[PDB]
Amino acid sequence: KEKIPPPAFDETFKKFTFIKMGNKLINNVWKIPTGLDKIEQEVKKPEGVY
Amino acid sequence: KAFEENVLPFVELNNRFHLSTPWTFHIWRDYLDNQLNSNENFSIDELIEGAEFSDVDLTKISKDLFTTFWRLSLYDIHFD
């Protein structure tokens, strides 16, 4: 003797997070910059230190 | 021909970066070898190919005999 309402099926998928990789250990590796210009600063002059 | 596109030319490997003079010549000796035995018009091209030298002064060392030290290997000094 009850009135059963129609069930509401969920249509929403889940969101992602800010970590574009899986772990926080893998993702900390892929955040440090690469390129030829960062090496150029420490090799500024060998004679200038000499 | 794929070699010169990846590795840096030593007119800027010695000027921009400063890795020292045995290392700069070590990458490049076998590449200047095959151009000098190619043709006489190819021979004059690589001997003028050079730039500033930070580690050595060509003011009191004779650049004719100084540069052919690093230009030559042991392929052509010794023979049996």
Curated annotation (Swiss-Prot), chain A:
* Name assigned to this protein: THO complex subunit HPR1
Function of this protein? Component the THO subcomplex of the TREX complex, which operates in coupling transcription elongation to mRNA export. The THO complex is recruited to transcribed genes and moves along the gene with the elongating polymerase during transcription. THO is important for stabilizing nascent RNA in the RNA polymerase II elongation complex by preventing formation of DNA:RNA hybrids behind the elongating polymerase.
Instruction: State the gene name recorded for this protein.
Output: HPR1
List localization entries: Nucleus
The species is: Saccharomyces cerevisiae (strain ATCC 204508 / S288c) (Baker's yeast)
- Additional information: HPR1 is not required for sporulation, and is not essential for DNA repair. It is probably not a DNA topoisomerase.
Give the record's subunit note.
Component of the THO complex, which is composed of HPR1, MFT1, THO2 and THP2. Together with SUB2, TEX1 and YRA1, THO forms the transcription/export (TREX) complex. THO associates with DNA and RNA in vitro.
Curated annotation (Swiss-Prot), chain B:
> Additional comments on file?
Present with 521 molecules/cell in log phase SD medium.
Q: What is this protein called?
A: THO complex subunit 2
Q: Give its localization.
A: Nucleus
Disulphide bond pairs? none
Q: How does it assemble?
A: Component of the THO complex, which is composed of HPR1, MFT1, THO2 and THP2. Together with SUB2, TEX1 and YRA1, THO forms the transcription/export (TREX) complex. THO associates with DNA and RNA in vitro.
This molecule's function is given as: Component the THO subcomplex of the TREX complex, which operates in coupling transcription elongation to mRNA export. The THO complex is recruited to transcribed genes and moves along the gene with the elongating polymerase during transcription. THO is important for stabilizing nascent RNA in the RNA polymerase II elongation complex by preventing formation of DNA:RNA hybrids behind the elongating polymerase.
Q: Which family does it belong to?
A: Belongs to the THOC2 family.
